[PDB]
Each structure stands twice: as C-alpha cells, then as structure tokens.
C-alpha cells in the first residue's frame, strides 16, 4: 500500500524523540562483534569437564539460543506495525534492536560451535512451559500486529516480548550466568558475551517501557491490561524456572568440583523480583 | 504462528552460507555513524550560494531522502518472508541491511537540518515517474510478500528494490553527486556520507543478486521474469532521469559559478549502463 509522503522530505527526523535518542545510544554502545570474542579458553574449560559437569551448563544455553533466535524473527511485526503508523524514530531504533538480536544469536551459536556441541540437539531442555512462551505465545502476540495494531495488541506484544522474555527471563539468565560461572572462573568468552548482551538488553527493555507507557498515557485503563498480561504468563515463567532448578539440583557435580553454593532459592527470588519491578516501571497515571 | 524449532538449538548457524559471510562483512565495514560527520562547512557552502544556485542541489537530495526512507520501511516484508522460510543467515544479514538504511535516512536528514532546509518541503521535486517507483511500485512489490512469497513474488521484489532502486538509481545518484559537487569542492560532509552510503549499497545489491540468482538456479524460466520486471520499470527510471536533467538544464548558475561542464548526456549514459549491467549480473543458467 502506497506511501503518501516521507517525513524526511516534508521535514526532518524528530531529533528530540526519545526513540531517536535511544537509537543514537545504540549506535554508540553497539559496536561489539561476536566474531572478535576469544572462545579458546572456553573450549578447554568445557573439554576439562566430566560429562556430568558438561551437562550442567547446557539447559541455560539451550534456553538462550532458542530465545535469541525467536526474538530475532519475532520483532519484525513490531517494526512493521510502528512503520505503518508513521513512527519513523521508533523504526530507526528498532533496526538497532533487530541487529543486536542477530549478534546475540551469533554469539551463543559460536560458543556452541567452539566448545564442541554444535551437533548436539539442545531442544531436549525445552519443557512445556518454555515452549508455551517461546514456541507459541511470543510469535502469536507479535504476528497479531500484522492484522491488529490496536493499543491492546501493541501493549500485549511489548509485554510478552520486552517485559517478560527480555525484562524478566533474559535479565535473570544473565544474573544466573554470573552467579555460577563467573564465580567458578569458567567460560570467559561466554561471560564476555553475556556482558555485551546485558548492555544491549537494557535498551530493548527501555523501548518496551516507552511503548507501553505511551499507550497507558492515553487511557489509564490499559494499565490493567498490562498487569493482566504479565500475570497470564507468570505460571510459565516460574514453571520454566522450576524445571531448570530441578535439573540443577539433580546434577550437582559442577557445583561440588568448583565449590559453588549455587543458591537456587536466591535465583528464584531474583526472578520474582525482576517480574515485580518490571510491573513498577509502568506508571498507571 | 508457532515456531517448530530453532536452528541454533538443533544445530548451528551455517557458517559457510554466503549471506552469513555478507553479514560478517557488513559488521566489519558498517561502523560509520552519521552523527560524526562534520557538516559545518556544508552549512557555509550552502549559505554562500545564491538562491538560484541553492535550488540546483535540492532535487537530487529530495530524491535520496524519500528513497532512503521508503527502503527503510519497505525492506521489512522481505525480512519477514525469508524468516518464515527459515533462511536464518539471510535474516541475520538483513538486520545489517535495515540498519544501514536507517543511517542513510539519518545522514540526508542531518544535512538538510544543518544547511537550513529542514523546514522546506522537498516533495515538489518528485514527479509522476518518481512517485510511480517510490510511492507505489516499491511498496506494492514488497508488501505482496506478506501474502505471496512465491519465487515470482520474491524475484519481483528483489528486482524493484535491489536492482532498480539501489542498483540503477542509487548507484547513478552517487555518481552524479561526485561528478558535480566533488568537482566543485562543495559539500564535503555530504560527500563523505555519499562515500559511506556507496560502500553499504554494494552489500545490498549483492543480496539482491544472490536472491534472484538462487531462484533462477531452480528454474531458468525465472530469468525471463527478471528481465521483464527490469524493463517494466525502465520508463519510469528514465522519465525521472529526464525530469532531473531538464531541471539541471534550466537552472545552470551553480555550474557557471563553479565552472562545471556538467555532462547530462554522460549522466544519462551512466544510468543506461547501470541498468544494462545489473541485467548481466544475473546468469540465465
Ligand atoms: C535456574 C534459574 C532460572 C533463571 C532464568 C533463566 C532463563 C534463561 C533465559 C532464556 C531466554 C532468553 C531470552 C532472550 C531475549 C532477548 O535476547 O531480547
Ligand atoms: C541527473 C542525473 C540522474 C541520476 C539519477 C539520480 C537518482 C537519485 C536517487 C534517488 C533514489 C535513491 C534510492 C536509495 C536506495 C537505498 O538507499 O538502498
Ligand atoms: Fe533483547
Ligand atoms: Fe540500499
Ligand atoms: Mn508444569
Ligand atoms: Mn513522462
Ligand atoms: Mn537478545
Ligand atoms: Mn540506502
């Protein structure tokens, strides 16, 4: 369907737009390249482990590799919907969002290749709760935007993607990686990647907050929808956390070997804290 | 619609895929930031010009600003279509393609802001032929991909976007900018941007060649479709070139002032040469 005109012909970019400012920060802070990460010591760490210790790390990597790939594919309908609404600065920013996710997919896949598990199918560590979030609910909410870009639909898409997948699960997985392997001295290349990912993710979450708040600013009754959509997904968030916890409690050899009191009760509470504080970053008024 | 699984969980990125290699080159060669270009001398050059000389440069900038904005919006359906086909490496590459176009929009809009014409509506320099390409035919061909991702549809989309808009018009506009202003010593910041754009554009055109050739490799009869779709748009390509030429011939004060024998017959022949050589980069066999 035709373009009726172009903002940068009739006028200019809105230089003061919050998403233009976020785009500018993304360019400045987004230079890192996964191809430059030295994974040679990760290969050695992984080979040094027993099979039982090897396993310990794979469920979390399985969750991230699928998650990064899902969000790379599934952000495209948001870019389309805001493009069709004429929100040029949002779209400029989203090009950095999408390119970030591509690098995130690349990073975890390089690590798998380097440590020797590229040929292993890690889908076995996706339980029903994970699938409900990543194989179903996320693509459903985003793809809806192609035929329904109502405020309700945009709120739901940003809530599932930015507040739950990124702002609750991703943030907690970054924390979990540091709490376990940074402590152990293991996988320095992976943890360099996690640090870069965590920096990118901050901008993604801020886009989600901006998006949800500007819709809530129009009609405070959308605040109730945001809360409702957060709570709808919580059972799957915690059901996946519990599954990963149960796997950690059953395979403890990496913990013993490296003297890690991995506090699964603390990890759980970090997740609950992440979820509650995303809710508090949306002001009803 | 659900994900059935993820390539980077079951396996890895196809590291030898041509579009993964193009993505890798795009990251290495795509660091430039329009925000770092010094436009202070462009502001002075522009203010130094007479109104009659001022006008000379605006039609070409008008064509580029709209063109960059159109392609930023209109590449999204190609990313979607290849994503839904599972072409993960194409999608990774396309994130760099989209982010490039965002920077291109930003670059021309910064120049307009800096030289003092941000408030001027440059739509007056889009004639009917230009509109047919950029306001209509381009969005029609790309948006079709949301409901029709047949080889015919993908060939047509790549032909309009990558071979005509980028590989014929953009390439010729880069040449035109150098032939006129690089000669004059004018607008150094703009020409720094043009150089960066021309480097990015090379990767975009190569994606289009890859895309069209891999479909032609399946069924040589698609070669005829490629040629047919190139010829369908030629009248609008040359009709826009003629319009810009006629405007250049009527407002010649910048040429006289700066002693430029602007060879409009040469510019025209560069366009014809661009078009014919894009055709020859697709092998029927
Ligand atoms: C054992 C403690 C549980 C901690 C929670 C771990 C969750 C793993 C994260 C996997 C999904 C990652 C989503 C990526 C989204 C993005 O990159 O924007
Ligand atoms: C007077 C000689 C005519 C030369 C032809 C000039 C055409 C101007 C170009 C405007 C469209 C630019 C399209 C940008 C596409 C992209 O950035 O991928
Ligand atoms: Fe993210
Ligand atoms: Fe381009
Ligand atoms: Mn359960
Ligand atoms: Mn005509
Ligand atoms: Mn990510
Ligand atoms: Mn461009």
UniProtKB/TrEMBL annotation, chains A, B:
InterPro entries: Ferritin-like_SF, R2LOX, RNR-like, RNR_small_fam
Domain of life: Bacteria
Cofactor(s) the protein needs: Fe cation; Mn(2+)
Residues that bind Fe(3+) 3: 101, 166, 201, 204
UniProt xrefs under Gene3D superfamilies: Ribonucleotide Reductase, subunit A
Keyword Metal-binding tagged: yes
GO molecular function: metal ion binding; oxidoreductase activity
Binding site for Mn(2+) 2: 101, 166, 201, 204
Binding site for Fe(2+) 3: 128-129
Residues bound to Fe(3+) 1: 68, 101, 104, 201
Record bears the keyword DNA-binding: no
Binding site for Fe(2+) 2: 101, 166, 201, 204
Annotated CDD domains: RNRR2_Rv0233_like
Pfam families (UniProt xref): Ribonuc_red_sm
Binding sites annotated in the UniProt record for Fe(2+) 1: 68, 101, 104, 201
Chain residues that bind Fe(3+) 4: 129
Biological process annotations from GO: deoxyribonucleotide biosynthetic process
Residues reported in the UniProt entry to bind Mn(2+) 1: 68, 101, 104, 166, 201
Sequence positions that bind Fe(3+) 2: 101, 161, 201, 204
UniProt signal peptide: none
Binding site residues for Mn(2+) 3: 129
Keyword list, A-Z: Iron, Manganese, Metal-binding, Oxidoreductase
Binding site for Fe(2+) 4: 129
NCBIfam families (UniProt xref): PRK08326.1-3 (NF006200)
Family of the protein in this entry: Belongs to the ribonucleoside diphosphate reductase small chain family. R2-like ligand binding oxidase subfamily.
Protein name in the entry: R2-like ligand binding oxidase
């Amino acid at each position: 369907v035709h373009h009726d005109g172009f903002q940068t012909v009739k006028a200019t970019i809105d230089w003061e737009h919050p998403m233009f400012k976020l785009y500018e920060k993304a360019k400045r802070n987004g230079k890192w390249n996964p191809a430059d990460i030295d994974f040679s010591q990760d290969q050695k760490d992984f080979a040094s482990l027993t099979s039982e210790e090897k396993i310990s790390a794979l469920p979390l990597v399985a969750g991230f590799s699928a998650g990064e790939e899902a969000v790379t594919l599934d952000i495209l309908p948001m870019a389309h919907a805001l493009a069709r609404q004429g929100r040029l600065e949002d779209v400029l920013f989203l090009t950095t969002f999408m390119h970030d996710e591509a690098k995130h997919v690349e990073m975890f896949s390089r690590w798998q290749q380097a440590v020797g598990i590229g040929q292993m199918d890690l889908s076995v560590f996706h339980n029903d709760h994970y699938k409900r979030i990543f194989y179903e609910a996320l693509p459903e909410a985003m793809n809806r935007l192609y035929a329904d870009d109502s405020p309700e639909a945009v709120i739901r898409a940003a809530t599932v993607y930015n507040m739950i997948v990124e702002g609750t699960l991703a943030e907690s997985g970054f924390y979990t990686f540091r709490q376990i392997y940074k402590k152990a001295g293991l996988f320095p290349g992976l943890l360099q990647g996690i640090d870069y990912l965590n920096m990118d993710e901050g901008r993604h979450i801020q886009f989600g907050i901006y998006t949800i708040q500007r819709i809530v600013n129009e009609d405070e009754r959308y605040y109730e929808l945001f809360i409702r959509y957060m709570d709808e997904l919580w059972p799957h968030v915690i059901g996946y956390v519990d599954y990963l916890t149960e796997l950690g409690k059953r395979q403890q050899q990496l913990a013993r070997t490296y003297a890690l009191e991995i506090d699964y009760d603390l990890l759980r509470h970090y997740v609950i804290k992440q979820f509650n504080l995303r809710k508090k970053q949306i002001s009803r008024t």
